[PDB]
Subunit: 142 residues, 4 copies
Amino acid sequence: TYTISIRVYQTTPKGFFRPVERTNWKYANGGTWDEVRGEYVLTMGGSGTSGSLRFVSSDTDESFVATFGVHNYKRWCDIVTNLTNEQTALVINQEYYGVPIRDQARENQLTSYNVANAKGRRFAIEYTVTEGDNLKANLIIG
Amino acid sequence: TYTISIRVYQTTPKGFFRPVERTNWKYANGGTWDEVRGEYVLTMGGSGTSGSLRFVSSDTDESFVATFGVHNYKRWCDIVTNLTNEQTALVINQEYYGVPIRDQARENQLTSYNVANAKGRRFAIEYTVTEGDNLKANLIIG
Amino acid sequence: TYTISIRVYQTTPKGFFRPVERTNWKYANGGTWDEVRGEYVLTMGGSGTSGSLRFVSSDTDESFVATFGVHNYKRWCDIVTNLTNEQTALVINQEYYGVPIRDQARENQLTSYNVANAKGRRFAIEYTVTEGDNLKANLIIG
Amino acid sequence: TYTISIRVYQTTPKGFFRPVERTNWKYANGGTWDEVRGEYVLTMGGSGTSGSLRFVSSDTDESFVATFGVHNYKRWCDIVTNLTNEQTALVINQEYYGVPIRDQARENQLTSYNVANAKGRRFAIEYTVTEGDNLKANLIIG
Ligand SMILES: [C]C(=O)[N][C]1[C](O[C]2O[C]([C][O])[C]([O])[C]([O])[C]2[O])[C]([O])[C]([C][O])O2[C]1O2[C][C]([N])C([O])=O
Ligand SMILES: [C]C(=O)[N][C]1[C](O[C]2O[C]([C][O])[C]([O])[C]([O])[C]2[O])[C]([O])[C]([C][O])O2[C]1O2[C][C]([N])C([O])=O
Ligand SMILES: [C]C(=O)[N][C]1[C](O[C]2O[C]([C][O])[C]([O])[C]([O])[C]2[O])[C]([O])[C]([C][O])O2[C]1O2[C][C]([N])C([O])=O
Ligand SMILES: [C]C(=O)[N][C]1[C](O[C]2O[C]([C][O])[C]([O])[C]([O])[C]2[O])[C]([O])[C]([C][O])O2[C]1O2[C][C]([N])C([O])=O
């Protein structure tokens, strides 16, 4: 069993990103999302699955999906931004298992990732615990 | 724009179901989940989409996915229980747009629905506001 | 250090009680409230303090404060209902340390308590773990 | 009826502040705290009361209480940090109605305020909507 505990840091009081969706991919006996002491906790039944969090800033028409999981017994992450209305977390989470551009991100098994949207706002995931069954990450909204 | 505001009632102190997942289908400009004044609020960009909530009772190894949406300008709902580990809300939400028996449930445009798991516990959805753009439902756990 | 983990069971879809306030009394090095896996977790720095949760049903003009704590190394609980607008949880929590009718409830060190409001709705606290540092209780709204 | 809607910004991945307490003062028919679309919403029955939020970073042994209210029909705010274990939000909220220095902070009717703890970290409140019945503020953690 794996857990990834995520601390969300929203660093800029221009716009406001709120949580809107949390998904579990179906491999590795699935998984769950829990809120624990102000943190998001993704629990997974084995290696080879993932879960996604979508955040939306309605004030500024910005959004992103942050995905966390374990691939071949190593943690991975990705961020997708500049979303169309059709790119829910349900959509994006599932794309990591069959869409080549997404598969490759997962296969990279990254301990950290940062991306900017069209407006220049940066978003980052940084794992603070990178090994073992109980992983930890900061999700940083610039 | 539709909202469906959901109040959860857990009616017996036998087992404890906790929220674990909330998904948005991609049709009709997608949608979001918000927590508002103790209720789960599904917001959708128009008619023809839906969102799902999964709840798990780890104490009693029970779970269910409740789905809410609007089909041809009328609200609908369904519950799936007896879930396999591969049946996350991500999976179940999508099945209402391709799987005949699930398609049929959506097409039923029900204001209320119930189903029991193999353990004999019943779950129900009851829309208390069945018309207009701000719909309301009780999710009742037996 | 003591914890009391509380599972809220809202059993009747007549009215809707939502969480509106959570307080910590100042004795025994204070305490905190956390949300953990859908449960409310009161953590206290020693014996002799408590914390309160207030719930309000705006639909039906009903409300109550449920207080949990440890007195002389034994758990206690109380429920106050039929609240005036001036009886916030901040008010009620503090009354257990100087108001005789409230002091006596605390001194009773109850493992369970049930009360009805003027409308006849029952509210109950039942501790499911009654000894040790990590206590557990159901809060049942009738 | 006033609402004050609060957005929390945690600006540095150094430490992690989590919500631990939310209180309502008893004047002006009291008030409530709700979570709405990722924001903390304080609702008050009129002018002359307030509510407090406490946040704790156990990682770095830091904490603060942020208080928001309306005094003589104008919004006010304060932050207290360098908290003792006996300074819960329950305690601090009440001090604004009897303790001269706290009374004075309320009487200041500030649209913005900041204070630093002994560790050099600054906290701020910034009202983004300063007039009317639906007030809005940023709570910024430095
Ligand atoms: C171990 C790992 O991690 N692996 C992975 C996977 O996962 C899996 O899946 C399956 C189905 O297919 C099941 O669910 C199980 O349980 C699990 O584990 C997957 O995810 C993939 C993607 O798709 O990846 C990984 O792997 C690699 C290769 N391809 C193989 O297969 O092996
Ligand atoms: C109106 C309605 O409801 N409709 C519906 C739909 O939705 C839709 O979808 C599309 C794509 O495909 C888009 O997204 C839009 O926007 C929306 O609106 C769908 O859902 C379906 C299922 O699949 O159902 C309904 O419809 C029916 C038929 N198809 C016709 O149209 O009519
Ligand atoms: C041990 C116990 O539990 N005790 C109690 C108390 O608590 C206390 O308090 C103090 C102040 O005063 C401090 O804070 C400490 O820390 C603690 O512990 C109290 O609470 C009381 C009520 O008021 O009760 C109990 O006790 C009994 C008697 N009175 C004595 O004092 O001992
Ligand atoms: C209008 C206003 O804001 N006022 C104020 C007050 O509040 C009040 O209180 C009372 C009792 O005491 C009752 O609760 C009512 O309802 C309310 O409104 C108070 O808070 C104070 C502080 O202590 O402050 C203000 O005022 C001032 C003076 N005292 C005169 O009046 O003016």
